[PDB]
Amino acid sequence: GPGGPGGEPGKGGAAAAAAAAAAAAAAAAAAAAGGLAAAGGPGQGWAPGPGPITSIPDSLGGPFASVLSSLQRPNGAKAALVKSSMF
Numbered sequence: 483g484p485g486g487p488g489g490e491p492g493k494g495g496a497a498a499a500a501a502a503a504a505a506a507a508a509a510a511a512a513a514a515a516g517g518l519a520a521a522g523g524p525g526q527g528w529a530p531g532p533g534p535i536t537s538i539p540d541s542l543g544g545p546f547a548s549v550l551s552s553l554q555r556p557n558g559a560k561a562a563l564v565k566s567s568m569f
Contacts, residue, residue, distance in 0.1 A: 484491060
C-alpha cells in the first residue's frame, strides 16, 4: 500500500488494460479471414442533410421572413376578349 491508512487508493491503470484487449481482439478478427478477402461496411442511414448549419434554428412553423416582393398585377381569370376584332 501507500504507507498505512489505505482504502480505495485509485492507482492501478485498469482502463489501460481494457483498451488493450479491444485492440488485441481486432488482430484475431483479421487472422480469422482465410482466402476470400471481404471487409464489409455499408454506409446507410444518418446521412448528411442538404446544407448543414452549425447553429440551425429549432423552429416549427411558418417561414417568418421579410420579403421585398409584393403583388402588382397577378393573373388569374377565365375570360377571353372577343371585342373590336379586325382580321
